[PDB]
Amino acid sequence: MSNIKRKKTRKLRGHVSHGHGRIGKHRKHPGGRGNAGGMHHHRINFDKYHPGYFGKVGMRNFHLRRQHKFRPEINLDKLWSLVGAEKFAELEKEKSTKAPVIDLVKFGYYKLLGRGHLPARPVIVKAKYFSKKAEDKIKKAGGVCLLSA
Amino acid sequence: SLGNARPLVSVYTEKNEPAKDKNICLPAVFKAPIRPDVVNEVHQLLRRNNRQAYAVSELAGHQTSAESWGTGRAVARIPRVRGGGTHRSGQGAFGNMCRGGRMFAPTKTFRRWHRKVNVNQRRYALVSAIAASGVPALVQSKGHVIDGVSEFPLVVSDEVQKVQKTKQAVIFLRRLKIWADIQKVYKSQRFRAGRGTMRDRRRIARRGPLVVYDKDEGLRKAFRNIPGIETINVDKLNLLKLAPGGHVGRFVIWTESAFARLNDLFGTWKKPSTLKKGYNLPQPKMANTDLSRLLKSEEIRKVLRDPRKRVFRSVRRLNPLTNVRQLIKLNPYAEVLKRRAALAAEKRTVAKVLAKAKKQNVELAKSHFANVATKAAANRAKLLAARKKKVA
Amino acid sequence: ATSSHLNWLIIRNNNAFLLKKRDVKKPFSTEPNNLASVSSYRYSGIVHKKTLGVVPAADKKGFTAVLKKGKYAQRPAKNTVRVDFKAGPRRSLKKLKNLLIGSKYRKDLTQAALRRASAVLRSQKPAPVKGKKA
Amino acid sequence: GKGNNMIPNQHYHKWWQRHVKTWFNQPARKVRRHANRVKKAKAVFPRPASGALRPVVRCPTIRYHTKLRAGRGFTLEELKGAGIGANFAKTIGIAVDRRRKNKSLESRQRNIQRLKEYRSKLILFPINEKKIRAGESSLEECKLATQLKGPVLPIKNEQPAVVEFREVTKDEKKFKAFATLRKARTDARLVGIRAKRAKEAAESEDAAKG
RNA sequence: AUCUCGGUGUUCAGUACACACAGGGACAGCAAAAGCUCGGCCUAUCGAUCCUUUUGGUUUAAAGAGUUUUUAACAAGAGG
RNA sequence: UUGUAUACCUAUACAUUACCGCUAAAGUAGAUGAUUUAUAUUACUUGUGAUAUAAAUUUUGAAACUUUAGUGAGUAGGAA
RNA sequence: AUAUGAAGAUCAAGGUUAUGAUAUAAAUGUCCCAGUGGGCCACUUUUGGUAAGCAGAACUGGCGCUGUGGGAUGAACCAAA
RNA sequence: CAUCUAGUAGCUGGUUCCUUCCGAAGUUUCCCUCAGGAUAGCUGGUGCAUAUAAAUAAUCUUAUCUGGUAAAG
RNA sequence: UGUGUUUAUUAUAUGCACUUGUAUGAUUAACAAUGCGAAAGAUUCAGGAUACCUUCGGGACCCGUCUUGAAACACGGACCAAGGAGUCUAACAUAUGUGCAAGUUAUUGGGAUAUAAACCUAAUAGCGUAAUUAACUUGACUAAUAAUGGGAUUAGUUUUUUAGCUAUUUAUAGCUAAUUAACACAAUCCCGGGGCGUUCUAUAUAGUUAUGUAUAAUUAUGCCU
RNA sequence: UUUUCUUAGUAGCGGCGAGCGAAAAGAAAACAGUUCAGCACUAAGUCACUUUGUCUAUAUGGCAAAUGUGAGAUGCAGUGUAUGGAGCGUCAAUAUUCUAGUAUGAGAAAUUAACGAUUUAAGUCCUUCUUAAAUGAGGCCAUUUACCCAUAGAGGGUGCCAGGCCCGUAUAACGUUAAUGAUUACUAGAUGAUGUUUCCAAAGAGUCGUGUUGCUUGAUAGUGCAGCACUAAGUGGGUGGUAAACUCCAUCUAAAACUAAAUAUAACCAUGAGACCGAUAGUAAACAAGUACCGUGAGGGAAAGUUGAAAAGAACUCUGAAUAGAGAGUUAAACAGUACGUGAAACUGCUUAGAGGUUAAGCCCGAUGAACCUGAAUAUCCGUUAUGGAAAAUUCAUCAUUAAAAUUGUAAUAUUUAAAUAAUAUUAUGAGAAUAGUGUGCAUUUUUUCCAUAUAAGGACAUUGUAAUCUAUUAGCAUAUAC
């Protein structure tokens, strides 16, 4: 499926050594096998390029459950793309007929973070968890966050 | 890009009947782009999905208890077969270079033979094999005798979908002047030049027309036995059958209820599809695409520079020390002193041949004293210049 | 999909008529309306209607029966005669190469057709010329 | 080896070519599993294809709070309120599984309509043409009008993408949540510290008349 | 011969330790005061991971929830 | 042998030229009555321009043609 | 004790870009990309050693990796790639 | 004897078509390291940013700083 | 520089028609001799290491290999024919191709049939779109309008302002030294800001709200700590 | 329960080094549930033999009789089972009906499946080459130029490549088996839920557990397993990824048992395939191959396919003691005669041609003798000439006239892209061309098409010699000036 016509086995026919030198030509494992020895003769290669290899920074969680730190998040940055496409500007008549009741647990999201630059319209967001700046820019525009599961 | 704009493909009846009472616009697939390198790559990866696994036996070459006589037994160090009395000891075992050894790396049955192509990239290649099954520059370049075929796309009635015998089916191809591509199919019937002949592919022909149909009342049975012909449903549309070989431009015969459904399968240039949920037609990188109209074109032509036209071959360096016509070209005022010294050199001659010949002093006429005694008496011609020019 | 410059790049390296011929790098192509069989850009099959084909005869060994340009008024979806319009000069060599330079008031492919016609007339000249050779 | 390489970790130290599995019967298992389903569905009656009932509630953890998948059950006290029939429901095929104890009432009312939705769709070909109490119809027979054999009997579902967007607009401009979660956190963070000082400070008056 | 937080020089791969340095933030010594004292006038006098072990928050976790013991974890030393 | 004199001989070096490559730069893409060129009628400048009638070259595998310059040692090795 | 310091941020005013010569196109990333990690010879300077076609270094040029002319001959010298 | 087993080898040996272009290294640090690595240098490939000055960059002159070797004592 | 005295020398003032006179825009072009490419097949002239043979002068050691150095008294190779050594796979990286692009990828399955292919498709999931911290927490500035905010270096843009060349509908065009604007695209350089962590510290905490001092009765009515 | 995808190379484990490494949830495939022991079952209510009647497989069967002999109270059946139950009570449906069997035929094949060498459409039609062989080449009224057939054009055979000569193939027919079960008959067994509600009530011991010890695991103050020591409880006991004690909460019910399906499959029975190998390959084995052969034995284990279409497998004669040689003969051919297709290289017997004391040979470069081979004039100077002849189209001939077919450029309408714009058809319009027809004329002096006749030559071509020019270059002379 791969070429070989473009591979270099086909260009080294027939030059003697096949890419590898007269002198210290291709032998089986001349530094060892795999990640060994990372503290001895491959020391420099493991720091640089991999610092933080060899040690132990700690707290052993026997049986992590990744269904505990789940929390899908969403910035204020988007947040208006969730409500449909033409209500974007159909409310900026100007006519404040609408704070959109958004429920993020029906959109798969659990926290509302706040990176934002949000517009001046009210919303009614219903996330599980809060960012503090999220609830400080939605209150600044006449909105809520209904603290709901 | 904007789709129809050569539109009205006409339906032809059984008797080739230069139109009908029906007229369909182009279903907008036929202006979607034909990229022949996408199709070549998508076809190639997708025809690998019919491959079967091969491998040598995993125990072959390795059915020997053969170790190495080491050194120094005057024979090289490979695993030689053990015992006695049987031609086979002690002979050479296990190696790629031995006779009976395992091959260099044996072929395994877990090569990746099949392939995952993106689905949107197999929709791109199907679309570029329908827009090339119009365009009679491209059907005429897959071979494909079509200089008596009525329209591109050939749409025929739904009455072709009821053809039930192969006798009726070849008359339809005779009446619609499709039979001249079947006759080129029979002239291509060969044997393969392999090796494939021993492996169940000795041969039959090359490819012919493709009859896209909508319903099958009888026509896949009736067209089954004709060489080169194959019949295909609208909604499926194999790319392996619609651009065979990775090459675009198969002669394709639609019916009419298989031509109504190309606006549902592939989308439209305004809306998406109905049957390929979310598919939009691919946009080209070039809408107008006629580089001949564009290079004319008076928006472009009024801003260009000039073709300024003389071409400068213009080489040989002449030597302006043995040339004079290259010295008097590069340095005029060479001419001025080259004349001013050659005229004085011609005047030094006359003063010499005069002052020598005072011991002979013969003539004064023409022979050895034309270049002497004429200019010795043309100093009377500069007696005027002192005498008659002081009137100013 | 409409252009010939697009059409060519789809065929300029594989079509049924391309003849690669091992050494002199690309001169050949065998499509029935070429006039100088080369694969060039539009000395070519389909040009969409300036496909000029000078051919013999029809009555071999008569004259140069020219398959002409097929131009606009059918679609160019092809025949059962619909797209091709086929007119054939005769009678001479000097008074039909002028009534083929005159049937082509427009000048670009003319002199490929005035050399393909002047070589079809030469190709059936040995039925009158180059006699019994005593 | 030479360097910058995403440290290798590939578990091939263990002679895994005796463990290799190849899957070229994958096209051939699609054909046989399909042809088993066809031969199953032809061999029942006009019964459903799949087809018993399989109740609907509630993928377990927080990650799948919201999804409402298909169960294996119907819960002997989901059957009970729905006019069933705990050992009649195995025959018309209602999945009667009884290691499931129903926790909520909502979980039991989510699936007690589903036992009356179907059985209001289930025509009961009779035994004797006496029509004991089917009580659907005579001439909606399985002689006559049935034989359609639906696939999945589904969840329905029925929007929950969702989005029928309501607007009020609402008045709760005073009632904060950036501090309601920092206090319901540290209520339970400090439950034991507050309930230990509660049984020393509020048990200082019991030594008066003791 | 203090507490802290980076930065630099050397060796150098411009990695580490270590040794020196030049600063910022304290808090203190001497001095009437300016002074700039961050060990020894300067160039030597020394040491990773894992482990163990102190000091340290007046802590974080043991994943059903509290309470105390235990263990763990993190910062800084020591044991080589 | 030492010190000199002229005159020659001798490289794959140097110069010029022919040819190959490589490098680097530049040109060319109105074909519909497109561009020219030689004649043959008129506006007019003396002369040129325009209409008209007298032969050709050009659909440059736009990955093609055309123009000009420099350049050429090679193991291990890389690349077309 | 200066909201003259010292840094910074702005408007003003300044002939002819401030030795020479050059421009093999230079700049910057990535594959940390292959081979290599035994060297050896020479002028000059050097250390050890009685000395060595010996041992060890600094400098630039060479052979390795390179034909051709010269030294009869020759890895390295002279000339020239 | 057969299998595990094609056990492993920093070691010896061999490693298969042509032309074109560019062209090394035997040094650094570190390693139970000294017939070997990893590391940096040297190499190639692939680009990219800038083509009908006052941008800069590298051996001399000028200005200035540095030096303890030859010589000198 | 100036002007005459002056005596010398160059240049411009050669239009029309014609012709076997330079760059032929790397020029090589002419006169003459020999020899006819015979209907089938000779001959004349020039050329040819075709595989050789003959003859002669110059050159010329035996290849592969490891090596600082091989013709080596280093190893291998008597000769032929066939066979004979950089692969497959898992995972990652860079690069290029291609598709779609806040996405993307159906490929475990299920459908639909035409056949191990091709076609359609649910619900998931992976990776990405949000990180940090040992952990608990926490989570990316008021751009609805600032691409990193600001600065510097900045290719381009009817941008945009200001003398002449060129065609003058006396317009409008195109080219240079200039006034601007732009995120001045991208990329580098610098200075900031923000999330988190850790440490200093300004919390008299003024405070601010809230279970609580108000009654109705679980609820909504006060200021305060 | 099991299998796949994902979780996840994750949590964990590890000289915390090398390395290793699961599971819940989620998504699929498939789905099927149950039985005991132990209670106030409340008449051993059970079973195996054997014999005797008597059914209808060639029955470790069916029923009954004697209840003949035994198992069984140290516990057999029925009810009933941790997911628990059993009796009362209500309340609401409620028989001569059902479920499961075998027997039987609905049905004059009535369906469907699998299996059957029993059955098939159309050319061996007319000429070339083979005249060794046709399956190859040509041809075959029109039906829109298939000769015919085709739901059959897969493959194989047959003296070359065959849809039509043959087997098959496609669709089927027939034939055989099996499955279906309308009724009837007999033997069984049975005749619901329950908003609800009082009483009765059995839950597995040297076994969990704990200590230790050993192996094992991802399991870390124990993941599983085992030995030993210790040995439970009945609101008890196990688990909740960190040991312990308290008080909770959730969650199951261990120490007894059965169970289809999805899943696996280098073996076996029968098949189909292939981007596989093509006789030093592919199995070791294409063949009398696990053979010949070797080893005391365990074991080791080859090599070896091909005459031709047909044996037509070389009668016969001569020579010889003879296989044989020579001549015949068969054959398309014995350069096909059993190294039987082809027949390479190494290596040489003979022939033929030159040469030989000249690195040992071979070699390179430049020539050479001999041999052989390759390529090469298409008409004038200071001109693809004036004349003169010859032929023929009979739209052309110059034109005029006519009939068409398109092009180009205007106009218009319907379509796309709704306003123009464009592009596509469908019409019309004009000028100029071209095609076929007729005619001052066929040549009326022209038009096409051929041949001797001038200027300076055979000119052109190649190979030479000459002469001149330009580049790069070598040598030689001397016309004057300055210092």
β-pairing verdict for A144-145 and B210-213: unpaired
User: Rounded to whole angstroms, how far apart are CA atoms B143 and B141?
Assistant: 5
Residue B46 approaches strand I within 7 Å at CB: yes
Burial status of residue C103 (CB atoms within 10 A of its CB: 0-12, 13-18, 19 or more): middle
Distance (Å) of CA B141 to CA B31, B125, B250, C39, C44: 19, 19, 9, 12, 10
B263-267: which pairs have CB atoms within 8 A and are 24 or more residues apart? B263/B27, B263/B28, B265/B234, B265/B235, B265/B237, B266/B27, B266/B28, B266/B29, B266/B32, B266/B123, B266/B127, B266/B130, B267/B28
Q: Answer whether D touches C (≥3 Cβ pairs < 8 Å).
A: no
Resolution reading in Å? 3.0
DSSP A125: E
User: Rounded to whole angstroms, how far apart are CA atoms D44 and D52?
Assistant: 12
- Cβ–Cβ < 8 Å for A106, A125: no
Chain D nearest-CA residue for B112: D22
For chain B, say whether D22 makes contact (Cβ under 8 Å): yes
Residue D170 token pair: 């609402």
> How many C-beta atoms surround the C-beta of residue C80 within 10 A?
16
Phi and psi torsions of A25, nearest 5°: -45, 155
DSSP assignments along C84-118, one per residue: ---B---S-STTTSHHHHTT--S-SSHHHHHHHHH
Q: What is the CA radius of gyration of chain B?
A: 45
Alpha carbons within 13 A on the beta-carbon side of C109? 27
User: Rounded to whole angstroms, how far apart are CA atoms B257 and B260?
Assistant: 5
For this PDB entry, the determination method is: cryo-EM
User: Rounded to whole angstroms, how far apart are CA atoms C53 and C64?
Assistant: 10
How many angstroms away from the CA of B196 is the closest CA of chain A? 20
DSSP assignments along B289-345, one per residue: --HHHHTT-SSSTTS----------------TTT-STTHHHH-TTHHHHHHHHHHHH
User: Rounded to whole angstroms, how far apart are CA atoms A83 and A124?
Assistant: 11
Residue D192 approaches strand G within 7 Å at CB: no
Q: Is the peptide bond before A48 cis (omega within 30 degrees of 0)?
A: yes
- Cβ–Cβ < 8 Å for B87, B100: no
Q: Contact D170/A84, CB-based, under 8 Å? A: no
At what angle are helices B119-127 and B36-46 packed, to 10 degrees?
Answer: 130
- Cβ–Cβ < 8 Å for B285, B50: no
How many angstroms away from the CA of B143 is the closest CA of chain C? 5
Residue D204 approaches strand J within 7 Å at CB: no
User: Rounded to whole angstroms, how far apart are CA atoms A101 and D49?
Assistant: 41
- Cβ–Cβ < 8 Å for A72, A109: yes
